[PDB]
Design a protein around this ligand. Structure first.
Ligand SMILES: CCCCCCCCCCCCCCCCCC(=O)OC[C@H](COP(=O)([O-])OCC(O)COP(=O)([O-])OC[C@@H](COC(=O)CCCCCCCCCCCCCCCCC)OC(=O)CCCCCCCCCCCCCCCCC)OC(=O)CCCCCCCCCCCCCCCCC
Ligand code: HEC
Ligand code: HEM
Ligand code: HEM
Ligand code: HEM
Ligand SMILES: C/C=C(C)/C=C/C=C/[C@H](OC)[C@@H](C)[C@@H](OC)[C@@H](C)CCc1oc2c(O)c(OC)cc(OC)c2c(=O)c1C
Ligand SMILES: COC1=C(OC)C(=O)C(CC=C(C)C)=C(C)C1=O
Lengths: 370, 104, 96, 66
């Protein structure tokens, strides 16, 4: 019982200098536990039949004791999950943590699984966004030649999104988080083989400190800040990161005129929307996420971290600003000049990752004479 | 009553459910052409509530004065959704306009 | 809903339990809509059954102005002016 | 019984921005009203005016309500 709880926590060697950017791993663990705990309690009152799904959710928020806080904690917790996910990935790119190939690639799988999980959860209340989100996203599969359409109808359990869809989605959404938990434990096991990277990108074996009490207390402090952010949202602005259209029950005959994705999917939606071709947009969407698996092969710098690399830093923040641009564009109508800004931002995204950054890496190497 | 003031009241509070001219279409409410001198619920082609059809009074300046002050009170069960016009003068003006417009 | 539409020239009065959370602008939107009916501007002619309301999307709504001074009497004697009635129903809708 | 909305609207319509907008509105009313078959209408001019007047109403109105 002791060991592996311990030598896997208590006396785990850790760099003496990891910064707050290293707090997101434990914050993601906490977001996962939060979602699982609030999720199970919501599932104790939720019913997946299309005639009663939306109703069961209002019953939770209106009549179940504290049902409203559990619900908005689950909704806003999903948002916190993504904020942390994006900070976590950003930390990895900036500091070259991706060189831990197994840990990194498992991480890419984790990002995709959380996205799929959050997607399905959003469908459960069966409001307007639920219904059209289910329709659009499952249809991404229709871009697959020969069987695409068949795969979609098979997923739906029919010729359109209906009862069979909602009921299986409740089942998928229910189990996936536990699968995510098992995948995350594997994520950590591979990390433990190497231990953590640090802001300098330089091996920290000459200066390790025990995880307890240094990072246990630092992680607790981080956890408190996460809870503050979550509760500011739940108690003072529970709908801020939500969409008013989902307070309207699903209507299969009418897609809201200003329909837009959940904020954490806006950058990817902007990219897909920028290509006036079905298959092309779907491939660009898939690639906007999967390209993360290519980062390790695109590393040209002789140094692991961007800490000592000025040019790479500038390009890194341009990428972040660009994702911010795509997020903004994803929230705007498909009209001029947004159509062009979005296309440029989409091109700039792939250009920074595939060309500009690897190039900055080589130039910096030359400037240092190696 | 002042016919011009009544026209303004009709346009703002009645027109959306009633036409007054001969041949005017029925809408949420019945066309009102020929209103004065006719019994309640007798405009052909409109589905009145039994409450309205059974009131049994004759529309005129007097009955309209009371009805328009509080429709539901005068005809319990009516499906006409209108709170009523409180001011006596406003009702007088509106009725003066109706007397003219529903007879031209 | 079919019966509702039939009773309202084809338009559907939506359920109001969540109207404030189901509309951008919430009560600011609902208050503005209720107190913002006005004449169509020059060059705009609406089909019968529709009313001009600058705050409704497209500006043509199937709901006739529902409130006005003295539309009801309050239990506490508060003067029932259109704006007062609008302000209180909106507060109630927020709670709902 | 007077609705403070009436009073407040009257007061707010006195602001420079509201008068300017009302003028553009009447200019559009004149132009459109004067043409045989035109597709233009004064929606934009009316909304500009209302946006200016209602921003002012919102800051004063509730001060007279219960
Ligand atoms: C909301 C957004 C959603 C995300 C969810 C929230 C999670 C937050 C991320 C986790 C970070 C939490 C954490 O571990 O804080 C440690 C960190 C503790 O810093 P420290 O103990 O003072 O470290 C000294 C520095 O290394 C040495 O620095 P120094 O001596 O120059 O002084 C800096 C210090 C003191 O300087 C002054 O401000 C004075 O200022 C602070 O850090 C405060 O607090 C923060 O950085 C604040 C987090 C901001 C949010
Ligand atoms: C029937 C005679 C009505 C009365 C009384 C009121 N409303 Fe209504 N309302 C009605 C209809 C038929 C419609 C549909 C309009 C359309 O063109 O779709 C409406 C709509 C509304 C809305 C929704 C507006 C939107 O953005 O979609 C609201 C907010 C609204 N109505 C509010 C409301 C309130 C609070 C009322 C009492 C003061 C009220 N309505 C009366 C029909 C009728
Ligand atoms: C459910 C999702 C995830 C969980 C629970 C999780 C958890 C963790 C934990 C607990 C650590 C150690 C602490 C830290 O450095 O933050 C870690 C490290 C790491 N994670 Fe994740 N992670 C998640 C998603 C991802 C994603 C999406 C990526 C990247 C595509 C990723 C990449 C990494 C890498 C490379 C490290 C090493 C960090 C370093 O030492 O510099 N993780 N993660
Ligand atoms: C990675 C973890 C999870 C994520 C990211 C997630 C995400 C979501 C999202 C975005 C919604 C819609 C919220 C809304 O109503 O606006 C949702 C709903 C729901 N989730 Fe989760 N969820 C997670 C885990 C769980 C688990 C483990 C269960 C149950 C065992 C669960 C049960 C539910 C239920 C019942 C709903 C419907 C009620 C509601 O809408 O609040 N979730 N989830
Ligand atoms: C102040 C304005 C209004 C006036 C003076 C007015 C007058 C009348 C009169 C005199 C009748 C009886 C017709 C008959 O027996 O043949 C009537 C019926 C009716 N009105 Fe109005 N009306 C007004 C506004 C409205 C409005 C705003 C609505 C709708 C929301 C409405 C809906 C109806 C309906 C549905 C009936 C038939 C009711 C039934 O069969 O019970 N009226 N109205
Ligand atoms: C049975 C399980 C299935 C079929 C799971 C499939 C999962 C697919 C992906 O996750 C891995 C997917 C969620 C992820 O793509 C990487 C997102 C970034 C896609 C984002 C996304 O969202 C939208 C959305 O939310 C909407 O809401 C109302 C509406 C939308 O357009 C009208 C979109 C949309 O156009 C896109 C691209
Ligand atoms: C040093 O790497 C690790 C963490 O980052 C500080 C953790 O938070 C947690 C939790 C684990 C298990 C871990 O191995």
């Amino acid at each position: 019982l002791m060991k592996i709880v311990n030598n896997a926590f208590i006396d785990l060697p850790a760099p003496s200098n990891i910064s707050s950017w290293w707090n997101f791993g434990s914050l993601l663990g906490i977001c996962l536990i939060l979602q699982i705990l609030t999720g199970l309690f919501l599932a104790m009152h939720y019913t997946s039949d299309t005639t009663t799904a939306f109703s069961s959710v209002t019953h939770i928020c209106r009549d179940v004791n504290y049902g409203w806080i559990i619900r908005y904690m689950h909704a806003n917790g999903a948002s916190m999950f993504f904020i942390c996910l994006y900070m976590h990935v950003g930390r990895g790119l900036y500091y070259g943590s991706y060189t831990f190939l197994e840990t990194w690639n498992i991480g890419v799988i984790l990002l995709l699984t959380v996205m799929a999980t959050a997607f399905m959860g959003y469908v459960l209340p069966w409001g307007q966004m639920s219904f059209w989100g289910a329709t659009v996203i499952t249809n991404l599969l229709s871009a697959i030649p020969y069987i695409g359409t068949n795969l979609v109808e098979w997923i739906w359990g029919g010729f359109s999104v209906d009862k069979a869809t909602l009921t299986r989605f409740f089942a998928f959404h229910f189990i996936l988080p536990f699968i995510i938990m098992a995948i995350a434990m594997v994520h950590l096991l591979f990390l433990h083989e190497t231990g953590s990277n640090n802001p300098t990108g330089i091996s920290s074996d000459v200066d390790k400190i025990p995880f307890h009490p240094y990072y246990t207390i630092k992680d607790i402090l981080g956890a408190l800040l996460l809870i503050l952010a979550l509760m500011l949202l739940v108690l003072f602005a529970p709908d801020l990161l939500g969409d008013p259209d989902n307070y309207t029950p699903a209507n299969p005959l009418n897609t809201p005129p200003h329909i837009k994705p959940e904020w954490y999917f806006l950058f990817a939606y902007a990219i897909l929307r920028s290509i006036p071709n079905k298959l092309g947009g779907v491939l660009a969407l898939a690639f906007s996420i999967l390209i993360l698996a290519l980062i390790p092969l695109l590393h040209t710098s002789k140094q692991r971290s961007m800490m000592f690399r000025p040019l790479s830093q500038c390009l890194f923040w341009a990428l972040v600003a660009d994702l911010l641009t795509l997020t903004w564009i994803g929230g705007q109508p498909v009209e001029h000049p947004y159509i062009t800004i979005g296309q440029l931002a989409s091109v700039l995204y792939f250009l920074l990752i595939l060309v500009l950054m690897p190039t900055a890496g080589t130039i910096e190497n030359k400037l240092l004479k190696w | 009553g002042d016919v011009e003031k009544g026209k303004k009241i009709f346009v703002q509070k009645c027109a959306q459910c009633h036409t007054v001219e001969k041949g005017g279409k029925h809408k949420t409410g019945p066309n009102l052409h020929g209103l004065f001198g006719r019994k309640t619920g007798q405009a052909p082609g409109f589905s009145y509530t039994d409450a309205n059809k059974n009131k049994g009074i004759t529309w005129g300046e007097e009955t309209l004065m009371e009805y328009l002050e509080n429709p539901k009170k005068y005809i319990p069960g009516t499906k006409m959704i209108f709170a009523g016009i409180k001011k006596k003068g406003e009702r007088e003006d509106l009725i003066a306009y109706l007397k003219k417009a529903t007879n031209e | 809903p079919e019966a509702a539409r039939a009773a309202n020239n084809g338009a559907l009065p939506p359920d109001l339990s969540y109207i404030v959370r189901a509309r951008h602008g919430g009560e600011d939107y609902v208050f503005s809509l209720l107190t913002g009916y006005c004449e169509p501007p020059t060059g705009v002619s609406l089909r019968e059954g529709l009313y001009f309301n600058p705050y409704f999307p497209g500006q043509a709504i199937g709901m006739a102005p529902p409130i006005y001074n003295e539309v009801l009497e309050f239990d506490d004697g508060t003067p029932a002016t259109m704006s007062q009635v609008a302000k209180d129903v909106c507060t109630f809708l927020r709670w709902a | 019984l007077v609705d403070p909305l009436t009073t407040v609207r009257e007061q707010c319509e006195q602001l420079e921005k509201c008068v300017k907008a009302r003028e553009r509105l009447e200019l559009c009313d004149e132009r459109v009203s004067s043409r045989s078959q035109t597709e233009e209408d004064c929606t934009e001019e009316l909304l500009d005016f209302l946006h200016a007047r209602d921003h002012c109403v919102a800051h004063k109105l509730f001060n007279s309500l219960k």
